[PDB]
């Protein structure tokens, strides 16, 4: 009966677009069942065995059923859905292992390139080759345009 806190707005960011429908469906399951539990009380009250025996002139059926009832015990349902927990962990892998290190390396890369930006000498100091290697997009790819100026003039 341990029910935990949720920031549903963040939760909504969780699922891919594919399963969002079932996600919201089970969310509605949650709310409806929560309210439904709020409806009924915790326990079915005691049966007035004394009063029944008093009014109920029946010989022993009163206390007969009293005892039998008190003996009978309900079948508590058993955890069977309670199995997909590895999902969490394997999801944890996808995010914390299969995504943590890949994102990390993407960063270390981007970090490196960035810090490789502040080290660029002031343009006054630079020289065409400086741009060429800094921005290969400023290359003139002479292999495609071996003749001067190596770019379509209209370009």
Partner 1 sequence: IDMEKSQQALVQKRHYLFDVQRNNIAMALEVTYRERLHRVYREVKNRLDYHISV
CB of 123 to partner 1, least distance (A): 25
Give the binding site for partner 1 (CB under 8 A).
Answer: 1-4, 6-7, 10-11, 13-15, 23, 26-27, 29-30, 33-34, 36-37, 40-45, 47, 52, 55-56, 58, 61-62, 65, 69, 72, 74-77, 79, 81-82, 84-85, 87-88, 91-92, 95-96, 99-100, 103, 106-107, 110-111, 114
**34/132 with CB nearer partner 1:** 34
Could you tell me the CA-to-CA distances from 152 to 66, 140, 147 in Å, in that order? 102, 10, 10
Measured over the CA atoms of residue 119, residue 123, residue 124 and residue 127, the dihedral's sign is positive
d(CA 23, CA 3): 18
Q: Are 149 and 140 in contact (CB under 8 A)?
A: yes
């Amino acid at each position: 009966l341990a029910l935990k806190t949720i920031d549903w707005v963040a939760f909504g960011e969780i699922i891919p677009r594919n399963q969002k429908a079932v996600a919201n469906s089970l969310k509605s399951w949650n709310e409806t069942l929560t309210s439904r539990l709020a409806t009924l009380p915790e326990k079915p009250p005691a049966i007035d065995w004394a009063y029944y025996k008093a009014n109920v002139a029946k010989a022993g059926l009163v206390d007969d059923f009293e005892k039998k009832f008190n003996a009978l015990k309900v079948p508590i349902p058993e955890d069977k859905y309670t199995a997909q927990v590895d999902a969490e962990e394997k999801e944890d892998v996808k995010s914390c292992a299969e995504f943590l290190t890949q994102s990390k390396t993407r960063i270390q890369e981007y970090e490196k390139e960035l810090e490789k930006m502040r080290n660029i000498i002031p343009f006054d100091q630079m020289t065409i080759e400086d741009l060429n290697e800094v921005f290969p997009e400023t290359k003139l790819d002479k292999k495609k345009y071996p003749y001067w100026p190596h770019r379509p003039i209209e370009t």
